[PDB]
Design a binder for this molecule. Structure first.
Ligand SMILES: *[C@@H]1O[C@H](CO)[C@@H](O[C@@H]2O[C@H](CO)[C@@H](O)[C@H](O)[C@H]2NC(C)=O)[C@H](O)[C@H]1NC(C)=O
Ligand SMILES: [Sr+2]
Ligand SMILES: [Sr+2]
Length: 275
């Protein structure tokens, strides 16, 4: 297991966003041409084992631990009735006090805030990716497709990402092999070597959130200089077309940087290889 390994994302120009927005309120449009310099992206979402190495090294206490609660999806025991603030829910106890990560060391770390993610990535000699880096990487060398792999949800009748099957929120059939999270190395990689870029855990990016984008061509854009929420990408194991079609690379959502939840993690990026 090399779950802190990075892959080289090649230099290129790509179309960020879409002129066929599916969630218009989220500023998926307009499509815009963005140039990205070559850099490195973590192949995997940061796992419990990998975060535990960080915590072991630094003593870091996450914002959820200090606040004393975090958001948990009701189905596995607020922004929606199915999100409950649970006392003692944190990265070690993802559904609250009497849950554990002992049996899921290779699953993505959860209940990590934007600040927690920055702390980890910087500790690791890395950083968060920008939204544009994240989206470019998500698209995996394909142009204007819905998903990392193309436009079909189940190409060749195969599951390609961990999202919801069944009637949300009452019934998760586990058709794709996982009701909650999957191991960070589950499912096929995309064209650049990334696993679970869409689905599984949401991923923080460095950008402040806005819904107002120009069509001007940009180079290594960093997002707006100010805001109140940071951008997160890719959707999660909770997402279903019926209520939440956010497992597309162009999709985007937000949370305040001190926020944490049972479907939200991250991966790191770097300009160059670290030690
Ligand atoms: C984080 O630190 C803990 C505590 O040191 C590690 O667990 C110990 O690891 C040693 C060495 O393999 C074992 O002999 C002990 O049995 C473990 N102690 C306990 C109380 O579990 C743990 O492996 C570290 N985590 C990571 C991801 O490196
Ligand atoms: Sr699933
Ligand atoms: Sr993901």
């Amino acid at each position: 297991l090399a779950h802190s390994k990075m892959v080289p994302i090649p230099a290129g120009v790509f179309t960020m966003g879409t002129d066929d927005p599916q969630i218009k309120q989220d500023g998926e449009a307009p499509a815009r041409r963005v140039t990205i310099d070559a850099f490195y992206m973590d192949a995997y979402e940061v796992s419990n084992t990998e975060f535990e190495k960080f915590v072991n090294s630094t003593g870091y206490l996450t914002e959820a631990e200090k606040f004393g609660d975090s958001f948990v999806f009701e189905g596995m025991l607020a922004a929606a009735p199915w999100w409950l603030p649970v006392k003692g829910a944190n990265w070690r106890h993802p559904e609250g006090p009497d849950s554990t990560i002992l049996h899921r060391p290779d699953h993505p770390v959860l209940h990590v805030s934007w600040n927690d993610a920055v702390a980890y990535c910087t500790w690791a000699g890395k950083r968060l990716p920008t939204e544009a880096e994240w989206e470019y990487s998500c698209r995996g060398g394909l142009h204007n497709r819905l998903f990392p792999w193309g436009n079909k949800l189940q190409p060749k009748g195969q599951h390609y990402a961990n999202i919801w099957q069944g009637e949300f929120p009452v019934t998760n059939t586990g058709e794709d092999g996982f009701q909650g999270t999957a191991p960070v190395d589950a499912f096929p990689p995309n064209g650049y070597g990334l696993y679970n870029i869409v689905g599984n855990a949401w991923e923080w990016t460095s950008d402040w959130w806005t819904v107002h984008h120009s069509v001007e061509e940009t180079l290594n854009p960093k997002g707006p200089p100010s805001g109140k929420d940071r951008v997160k990408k890719g959707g999660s194991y909770m997402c279903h077309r019926s209520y939440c079609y956010r497992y597309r690379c162009a999709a985007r959502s937000q949370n305040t940087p001190d926020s944490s939840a049972s479907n939200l993690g991250f991966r790191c990026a770097a300009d160059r290889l670290p030690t």
